[PDB]
Amino acid sequence: EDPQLLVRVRGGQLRGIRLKAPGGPVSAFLGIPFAEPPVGSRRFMPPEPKRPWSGVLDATTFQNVCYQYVDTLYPGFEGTEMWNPNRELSEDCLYLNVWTPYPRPASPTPVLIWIYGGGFYSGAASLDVYDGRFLAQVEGAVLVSMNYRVGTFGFLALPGSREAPGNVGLLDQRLALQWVQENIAAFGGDPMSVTLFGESAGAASVGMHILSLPSRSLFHRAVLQSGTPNGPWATVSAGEARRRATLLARLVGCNDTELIACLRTRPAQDLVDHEWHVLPQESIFRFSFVPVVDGDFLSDTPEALINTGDFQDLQVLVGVVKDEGSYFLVYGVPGFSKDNESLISRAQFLAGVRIGVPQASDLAAEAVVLHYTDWLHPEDPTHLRDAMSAVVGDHNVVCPVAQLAGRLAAQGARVYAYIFEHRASTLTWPLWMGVPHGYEIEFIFGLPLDPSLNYTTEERIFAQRLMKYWTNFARTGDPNDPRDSKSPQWPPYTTAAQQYVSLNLKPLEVRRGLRAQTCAFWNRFLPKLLSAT
Template sequence: MTNDILIAKTEYGKVRGKQTISALGTEYISFLGIPYAKPPVGSLRFKDTQKPEPWSEIYDAIEEKSHCLGIDSTTKTVKGSEDGLYLNIFTKNLKPNKLYPVIVYIHGGAFLSGSSKLDIYSPDFFLMADVIVVTFNYRVGPLGFLHLNDPELNVPGNTGLKDQLMVLKFVRDNIENFGGDRNNITLVGHSAGGGSVSYHCIVEASKNLFHRAIIMSGCALNMWALTPQRDWAMRLAKILGYEESEEEKNILEFLQNADPVKMTEVQKKLIRPEEFGKITFAFAPHIEPYKTSETFISKRPIELIRTAWSNDIDILIGGTSDEGLMYLENIREMPALLTSLKLTNMVPVEITGLSVDDPIRLEFVEKLRQTYYSSSEPTKDELGFCKLQTDRCFWHGLQRIVQGRQNSGGTGRTFLYRFAVDSPTQNYYKISRFGPDLRGVCHGDEISYLFKNKCCAVPEQNTLEFKSIQRFVSVFTSFASNGNPNSNVIGADMESVEWKPVETREPPFKCLNIEEHLKFEILPETERLAVWDELYKTTKTPLY
């Protein structure tokens, strides 16, 4: 390729990409590290996202830039830089005969870690189809979610979500110059990224910036996806040595000059013992304390869902069969999580007004015991706890999103999936933490069936692993291309199974169950999830 074929225009200036060949032999152009916002440093720390300064020279987008500061999930150390607001674009052709559908992917990481690094998110598998893939970094932890209550300081929070919003606007305004169709954008995210996609689907700020959505293993109704307003900024300042007044102006000045690495390191220490189990993260999406022209979250998600603009667009939504296996890592780090487990504390935080010995609470606890533990002792049963967390932290919220859409009167279709391919070589998240012998499909295991990562070799073509990659990529790229996940744009072996949208207003819901073979069947978790549904109904707490 000549250099001219590698240069694309953006509204801020020209960028030069580099020719790349995928692990499957597909030629494409990588544009790495394009700035989509001003670096949020100095006086812009904690502030809403701002457009980048234009550039006059051609910008070399040929190597990855630093990602945003966060806690590395493997080493548990802080990595990255405050100057991390960059995106990557992967396209086969800047001037195709027909513009490509666009997939914008939001990484996960519990709102305190994660990045778009090619080590984990290389687009090789997606590019079996004629699509463009966009990945990016966004602010996480206190730098991405700290808020202050004083409107004059202009720190309402949720800047991590506003970074994502800026990416969606960049894609809308520039993607045609990379060969992409600005009228055919699918927003995809996993875990905290799935929670983020779920928020973009229900807030007015993101309306019409994408045309379909894929929500993976996380949503706005999961307990961890909304953090309550507390004095997080003050707690953070104090733990870093602040000793002055509680005046927010002084707190902001202190924190804008504090070491961002230390700030990122200490964030988990801010949750008090009495808040354990009720608050998952100090810094995560929250209802902003006052309204501005840039307000992102103004009400509880449950209120936004009912009239969400996205009830009229199609979505795919689902998770893995054993999401909660990830909690084995927490149990091994903090055995007390299990040994001091009280099932009475498993009542969702939305359900208020039940005393410790309320008969409704006690009956619910008994049902939890029967459903997840049978005859075992909860304080000793690791896998029982993981199964409970699968539903409590993931699947129940996902099912409630489906219920909300099915009862909204909207015209959008909802396709439900469940990923259950249990491979000893391809399930990267589980293998990297627990080795290849643990059975079950953990939270995060499906990512390595969409993106190539540095730890998993590309499987041989006749293996279950490669077939599963083709199938998973097929439903995602087919849906992104034309709204029909059955259209099989890459010719995968789909075993003649038709995936229909959810048809009923209430569970049981049918899903595409992706195991060694494909099945279109009632979601296997349905019976367990009914236990949680019943608690909401008994306490007259809205499910949607």
């Protein structure tokens, strides 16, 4: 009974496991319950604090992954499977993991809380890419990750109802943050220095915690990687959530109270079966059950909230990867596949745009096509392919991120921005997808430090660099190594200068304007095209 692996939290005792990281041991506490299992009558409902437990709860193993769609587009392919559940599915999934240095830190240590992506329909804190051992070992970071409900279970709302208020997945996260405030000191984490970080939907979730007052007392800093609360995909209106919930119910054979009672009687997989048959249009980067603008958790739209919010005593790190949109195209854009080079035609491109920007009118779609057509090579297949990728990445990530960075900086935040441009050597996706959505995570988490993963020496040093930026940010609100001069400084992002840095194998390069012209098209023009028409 190693006394370093034995901790007492408000609910009782836990016993972790000593895990091996390349440069030494780390204490891991895996599958710590933070909520009552949200099962039976508690499906679709807000989480409640886990009741205390007797004796020593075994926290040496990852708990169940929340009930979700499992991906089958490319069975047995590592590129898709790395995002697939790696533990048993179960509605009983409200668990969090903690990694600390071994021995557990002597002084209060900054806490990083990870919030996975997965389009609000999938994900799990237990994937290899979110492994906290390296950050814990190399940087001395106390790292926390939590499971939160996804799909219908986390996000199906009948807004205004008592039994499906919506945003419960987000409340799952909030409860885990609450859990951190109350318990992390026991692990030698500093509750007064909690940085949230997340990618894709996890990034949108971080952004919603920024935009939701009761979350603000629970962290001091945020990192949003390739995702935002604003933009086309991260939220739906009350009216729209009701409609999909209503539609899914009918689809599974089901007054709010009565409708929800019936949904609660259905096996999990039944709801997941028809999850994807509620989207209003054929569309990539669109997700059935996502956070709802409820006038509660989110008092207004994220757009409204970031335009008017006061972000003065807040530090934010935000960024994107070089090819945000490539990944998504192979999920229903004709002409796109991982298996060939996906050189498309002009016609495939116009049809592709109606899917990538599914909310767009004929006119708006035309505006898009005409903006993204390189007019010197109008029908070049490489150009059209790369442009399709760009349309989707810009619409869904880069421009919402630029939009967020701008508003936050204008309104008092300290903002640091990046673009991630190193394609992992081990990437199993074809070359044309470039640096796809999500392939920066393994690097931030420090996976290349595991010599058995066959990442290049260079990639290992890169990963060390990134872990340093992220943890320096966690530590100070500033990603710069406060002992260094060689390698330029990472300047804050501002609305004036619009400075961001490229993250890749070369030293930091400062660039200005993050797709400034193209994001002006998305953030300023297209709205007007739809608000008048």
